[PDB]
């Protein structure tokens, strides 16, 4: 029951110039062949993600990842997973309760000396490549009440997007099914719904802020994509494919906080990156008590919040 | 000590605007959501939204959806809040407030009130 | 949610500031003089920080939030405010008899 620091592991070799295996070689051990789990004797342990400390971790390595390899220096790079493994004395467990929210007891604790395969993608609004949930969609907050607190929705269906710029210099568009998503979305809202004493739910685009958080905000071909994400949350569902505008930029307020960024118009040639929604980031719109609706406009929270995600069931203890 | 001074106030005819600010001493600008509140004449405090100093999301309520804008400025390490087409119910005492390190509420720390009056 | 508009207390004496409504939403309470910006003495229900006196004491057991205080003295005439997360209640103006 403590919080100490930890070690990765990559399956990564350092042969090629890409920004993530040469940074993991060195700074990670090669994935180790031992997998031991051992399913503990019926022990019922609380978690809470929220006051994780290995997220705090992983955002230093990804701040440093991208301190060492970005400049204004060009190269292609993809997220390869990242393990997490732990010395002798500091062991982490983990939850396996089918459907657990990340702030309760697990029943089935089993206990890996070292994470899964996570790759470090950082996004906005939705949480792309991700891990999907296993029987229904979660709901995950400190709690629900508090609009501060962010909301994260754990989907167990994986939706495709395909985002793409063609060979119009910085245009893009970025195409989705439109019946899987409104198909979700009627899912989640159902789950909300539930919830909320069956409250009415409304989605709606963000109030407004900077683009990074206005928008579907990430990173592809080393080109940052920013995507006007107004058909998803059309609340009025539109049943065909949906093209999602979007441009690619090179000012950027650098998503630490430094300032705004400047690199080099994007390399010549196709961009595509097909990937998968796996998650949604959610902030209830506050105050309203007597009202019976329940506003919803994606993204919001830190990047923290992105590998929080992610590390919703595994926790450093003493031995 | 953490301090949040607001002088943007004053007495503005119907219709119109305003653009109310504050700012913060001590602590990090970019953390800690930062709370626009209203409390109107010998009535009880309404809370108007609040604002992320990181890169601007902001979260309105309901009745001011569309008059109200929240912005910031990181070097001045302060924040905006523009009310557009008042009404004279608006009259009233604005305040910007935070809460403790962990995250928003309850407000531990207030501003100091700025009197706005919508008046002929 | 609901506080009473005003009460009214000799010195020395013990009142009570009843706060329904609540939703179980935890409560914290203010304390505001005319012009000041409110000054919160109560957080999570049964705390206080540095600087509240002993005569200030709160418990929510349930959706009725309560602040006692106890021997009235000059300090104490304000405005009360029950709150929950961005919800305050419309204030209790408490009135020592001077």
């Known amino acids: 029951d403590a919080d100490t620091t930890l070690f990765c592991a990559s399956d990564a070799k350092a042969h090629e110039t890409e920004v993530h295996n040469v940074w993991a070689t060195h700074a990670c051990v090669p994935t180790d062949p031992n997998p031991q789990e051992i399913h503990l004797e019926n022990v019922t342990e609380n978690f809470n993600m929220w006051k994780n400390n290995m997220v705090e971790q992983m955002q230093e390595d990804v701040i440093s990842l991208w301190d060492q390899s970005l400049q204004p220096p060009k190269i292609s790079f993809d997220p390869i997973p990242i393990h997490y493994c732990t010395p002798a004395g500091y062991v982490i467990l983990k939850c396996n309760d089918k459907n657990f929210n990340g702030t309760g007891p697990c029943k089935n604790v089993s206990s890996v000396q070292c994470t899964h395969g996570i790759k470090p993608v950082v996004s906005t609004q939705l949480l792309l490549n991700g891990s999907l949930a296993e029987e229904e969609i979660i709901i995950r907050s400190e709690n629900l009440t508090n609009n501060a607190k962010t909301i994260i929705v754990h989907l167990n269906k994986s939706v495709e997007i395909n985002c793409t710029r063609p060979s119009d210099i910085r245009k893009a568009y970025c195409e989705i099914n439109g019946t899987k998503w409104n198909k979700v979305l009627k899912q989640v809202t159902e789950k909300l719904k539930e919830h909320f004493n069956n409250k009415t739910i409304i989605f709606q685009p963000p109030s407004g802020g900077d683009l990074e958080i206005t928008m579907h905000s990430f990173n592809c071909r080393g080109e940052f994509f920013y995507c006007n994400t107004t058909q998803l949350f059309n609340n009025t569902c539109c049943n065909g494919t949906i093209t999602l505008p979007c441009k690619i930029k090179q000012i950027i307020n650098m998503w630490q906080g430094t300032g705004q960024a400047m690199y080099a118009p994007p390399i010549d040639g196709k961009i595509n990156c097909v990937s998968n929604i796996t998650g949604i980031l959610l902030t209830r719109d506050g105050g309203a008590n007597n009202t019976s609706n329940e506003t919803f406009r994606p993204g919001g929270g830190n990047i923290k919040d992105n590998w929080r995600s992610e590390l919703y069931k595994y926790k450093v203890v003493q031995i | 000590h953490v301090q949040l001074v607001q002088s943007g106030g004053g007495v503005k005819k119907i219709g119109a605007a305003v653009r109310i600010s504050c700012e913060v001493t001590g602590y990090k600008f970019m953390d800690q959501l930062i709370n626009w509140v209203r409390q109107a004449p010998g009535q009880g405090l309404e809370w108007m939204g609040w604002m992320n100093p990181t890169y601007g999301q902001v979260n309105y309520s309901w009745r001011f959806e569309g008059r109200v804008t929240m912005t910031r400025d990181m070097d001045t390490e302060t924040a905006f809040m523009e009310l557009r087409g008042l009404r004279v119910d608006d009259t009233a005492v604005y305040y910007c407030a935070r809460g403790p390190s962990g995250e928003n509420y309850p407000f531990h720390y207030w501003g100091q009130g700025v009197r706005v009056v919508v008046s002929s | 949610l609901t506080q009473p508009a005003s009460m009214s207390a000799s010195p020395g004496q013990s009142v009570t500031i009843s706060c329904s409504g609540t939703?179980?939403?935890?409560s914290a309470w203010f304390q505001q003089y005319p012009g000041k910006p409110p000054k919160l003495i109560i957080f999570?229900?049964?705390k206080r920080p540095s600087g509240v006196p002993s005569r200030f004491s709160a418990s929510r057991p349930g959706d009725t939030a309560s602040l006692t205080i106890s021997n009235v003295q000059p300090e104490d005439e304000a405005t009360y405010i029950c709150n929950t997360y961005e919800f305050f209640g419309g204030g209790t103006r408490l009135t020592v008899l001077s």
């Open positions: 999570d229900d049964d």
């Open positions: 939703r179980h939403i935890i």
